[PDB]
């Protein structure tokens, strides 16, 4: 049958021209499509982490959703998904404002279910550092670079003219040890992990406003709040298709609780993945 991840938000009340009672959903939701026949509207049911809703509603077709979206600018509708079995604990990528706090809280509050991978660096090992503990210390920039071009790293960067990178093997190492690897990385690492058959749980924290940002962090100035909100907008525009979920709240506590639940809901041995 056809199972789909919703890449956008749908509100019945907002849409006119519905043939039957619609089914309104949120981004990230998984929908079971009962009949795709009409070239306009589809009949689907919501798929919950617990059950499968006994209900039916009308959702716009992929075709319909796209014409509407394309009509504006001078396209995200539905991502077909399959249920897949995993032998590993999925990595976790939180993105958006407050993500760092959310990362710190997961590791602190649940040390057994969460952890950090060992990154690679070309920075010369200090006498007190142990290779394999702090970093995997690469003794050749040439080698480090060849590793990068060969896609050994899901992310790489520079600090004080030293190369740093986050290895796939290194992430897979925590994943197989039974912990969610908490990654501080950009939206680009998401696809690489997927390509690597390690499917991260990717959660974006979407600020409702600049005020929303300022309320959760009271020590930010207007300039900072403005900047923080503006980079969250482009982050969302760039990576949206690659998010497993998007969360909003009026408080950090509210956001955090949601991420804990989503991670829980996404942490089973069977997960929904793109069909390809």
């Amino acid at each position: 049958s056809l199972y789909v991840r919703a890449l956008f938000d749908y509100d019945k009340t907002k849409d006119s021209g519905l043939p039957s009672q619609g089914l309104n959903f949120k981004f990230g939701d998984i929908l079971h499509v009962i009949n795709a026949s009409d070239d306009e509207w589809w009949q689907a049911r919501q798929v919950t982490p617990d059950g499968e809703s006994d209900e039916v509603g009308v959702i716009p077709s992929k075709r319909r959703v796209e014409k509407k979206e394309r009509a504006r600018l001078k396209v995200l509708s539905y991502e077909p998904v399959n249920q897949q079995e995993v032998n590993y604990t999925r990595p976790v990528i939180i993105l958006g404002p407050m993500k760092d706090r959310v990362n710190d809280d997961l590791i602190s509050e649940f040390p057994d279910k969460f952890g950090s991978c060992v990154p690679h660096t070309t920075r010369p090992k200090r006498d007190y550092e142990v290779d394999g503990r702090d970093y995997h210390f690469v003794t050749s920039r040439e080698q480090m670079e060849k590793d990068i071009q060969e896609h050994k790293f899901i992310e790489a960067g520079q600090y004080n003219n030293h190369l740093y990178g986050t290895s796939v093997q290194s992430v897979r190492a925590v994943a197989e040890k039974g912990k969610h690897c908490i990654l501080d990385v950009s939206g680009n690492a998401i696809k690489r992990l997927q390509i690597a058959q390690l499917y991260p749980i990717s959660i974006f924290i979407k600020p409702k406003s600049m005020e929303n940002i300022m309320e959760m962090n009271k020590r930010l100035t207007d300039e900072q709040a403005r900047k923080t909100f503006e980079r969250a907008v482009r982050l969302e525009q760039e990576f949206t298709e690659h998010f497993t979920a998007i969360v909003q709240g009026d408080t950090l506590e509210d956001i955090y609780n949601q991420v804990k639940q989503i991670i829980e809901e996404q942490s089973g041995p069977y997960i929904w993945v793109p069909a390809k």
Binding site: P119, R123, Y135, H151, A156, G157, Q158, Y159, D184, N188
Partner: peptide, 15 residues
């Protein structure tokens, strides 16, 4: 730690 990772200038990577 890890401080250096906290601040990095990221590099674009090949497809």
């Amino acid at each position: 730690r890890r401080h250096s990772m906290e601040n990095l200038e990221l590099m674009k990577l090949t497809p």
